[PDB]
From a paper:
Human [name] (hsGLTP) forms the prototypical [name] fold and is characterized by a broad transfer selectivity for glycosphingolipids (GSLs). In human [name], a glycolipid headgroup recognition centre located on the protein surface enables selective binding of the GSL head and ceramide amide groups via multiple specific interactions. Encapsulation of lipid chains within the hydrophobic pocket involves a cleft-like gating mechanism that results in two glycolipid-binding modes. To elucidate the structural dynamics of the [name]–GSL dimer and associated adaptations, we comparatively analyzed nine novel crystal structures of wild-type [name] (wtGLTP) and the sulfatide-specific mutants [name] and [name]/[name] complexed with N-lauroyl-containing monosulfatide (N-lauroyl-3-O-sulfo-galactosylceramide; hereafter referred to as 12:0 monoSF) and disulfatide (N-lauroyl-3,6-di-O-sulfo-galactosylceramide; hereafter referred to as 12:0 diSF) in different crystal forms and compared them with previously studied [name]–24:1 monoSF complexes.
Because the double mutation [name]/[name] restores the open dimer conformation along with the local negative charge repulsion in the dimer, we also studied the crystal structure of the double mutant [name]/[name] complexed with 12:0 monoSF. The mutations [name] and [name]/[name], which reversibly regulate access of sphingosine to the hydrophobic pocket, mediate the regulation in the disulfatide (12:0 diSF) differently compared with the monosulfatide (12:0 monoSF) or in the short-acyl-chain sulfatide (12:0 monoSF) compared with the long-acyl-chain sulfatide (24:1 monoSF). Similarly, SF complexes with mutant [name] systematically deviate from those with wtGLTP or the double mutant [name]/[name].
Numbering used by the authors:
A (entry chain A), B (entry chain A): 8 to 209
The structure:
């Protein structure tokens, strides 16, 4: 689980990186090599943030510190630079995972295709990522979607094989989502208040 | 350029890894982020081979040595294991690049779509990779193809911006292809003679 936010809503960079570093692996709950490239993309963002943090953990103590430091370090190349860029993209992958899991927990489904997770992934994609992809990457997403597992399998993949009902799994996901969602929200507000959000497409 | 093969047709592992390590970058002659994941896939194979070589460069002096050593090291998990696996997949990416470049040099083109390289890429894909992909990855290839550059641009990307005619570029590619193709051929023969080739799909 992620720490709760402190009253000052500052997010400590070290603890944050340690928590998010447990996310990429999970993509192998999706159960197909198609998603391995995605894990490495997310993992790349986390690496890049850590490599900058590691250079001066004090200067880069909080996520806010990264943005404001890099803003003065880089001038006109900022925010399309350094850890600020990497975190700009990491927050979008995190949000995808948040929206996807929340949509599953909220019982959203396609009533005639109940064992799939395609509607949940698509919603997650539309809310987190689609705005930032050109059509080639969108078509790539559409194709990749088909590699997505059955809901039943996914959930069983989430519970480390450990024998809990689907209902119990979802209750634990809901618990995870509280501090996760609040953390992602704070990162998005920081990007807004720093005018560090860019809208270019890949 | 790659060294020529020696009379014994053994391929020294160190020099081979150094030569192929100059290939991934080029994928950024394709001129779009869609191909960055592919670079990292190929680069991953080269890393994995090097990490095994590095452990005992003498024991792993040649590519042949890697296969025969791993065969006795691993038993029934071989050849779907270690550097033998990584090289099994690396040779396929290398072959793709060989067939693609050769097809371009041979003047193969779609006469009504002359400025594209799609026929060349597809041929390269059918000859090197398609057999080893399931349909999701094939559809992903089809979508990605659209990110491929114009022939004119690609060629200009290959000549480090340096101002040589297209004809001169192709002549240099043809020269590159001689030892490259002969090297890849030798690797494929080794996999055959070692019964190390596997046909599973991703
Ligand atoms: C043979 C076949 C040929 C195969 C070719 C296949 C190519 C596939 C291409 C699509 C890969 C998806 C990744 C796309 C990424 O390009 C983008 C931007 O990525 C960022 O780009 C920045 C520069 O603009 C920096 O380089 C960042 O690098 S940095 O150095 O600043 O750190 C880098 O991550 N990230 C994204 O779109 C984020 C993706 C998050 C995904 C979240 C999970 C989604 C799961 C959905 C599954 C149902
Ligand atoms: C948001 C959107 C969502 C995005 C999701 C996109 C996902 C894209 C998936 C396709 C990526 C292409 C890579 C496929 C790879 O999966 C395969 C096998 O890869 C191997 O697998 C082995 C295990 O079976 C070992 O893990 C190898 O790992 S190891 O550790 O043994 O070293 C590993 O490379 N390699 C391949 O297919 C080889 C690919 C070579 C490509 C050659 C260049 C082609 C250029 C064509 C361009 C016109």
């Amino acid at each position: 689980l992620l720490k709760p936010l402190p009253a000052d809503k500052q997010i400590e960079t070290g603890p944050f990186l340690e928590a998010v570093s447990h996310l990429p692996p999970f993509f192998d709950c999706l159960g197909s090599p198609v998603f391995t490239p995605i894990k490495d993309v997310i993992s790349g963002n986390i690496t890049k943030i850590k490599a900058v943090y590691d250079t001066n953990p004090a200067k880069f103590r909080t996520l806010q510190n990264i943005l404001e430091v890099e803003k003065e370090m880089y001038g006109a190349e900022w925010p399309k630079v350094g850890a600020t860029l990497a975190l700009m993209w990491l927050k979008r992958g995190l949000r995808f995972i948040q929206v996807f899991l929340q949509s599953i927990c909220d019982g959203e489904r396609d009533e005639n295709h109940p064992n799939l997770i395609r509607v949940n992934a698509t919603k997650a994609y539309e809310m987190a990522l689609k705005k930032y992809h050109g059509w080639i990457v969108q078509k790539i997403f559409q194709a990749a979607l088909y590699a997505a597992p059955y809901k039943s399998d996914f959930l069983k993949a989430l519970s480390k094989g450990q024998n809990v009902t689907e209902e119990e799994c979802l209750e634990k996901i809901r618990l995870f989502l509280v501090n996760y969602t609040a953390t992602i929200d704070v990162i998005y507000e920081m990007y807004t208040q720093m005018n560090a959000e860019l809208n270019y497409k890949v």
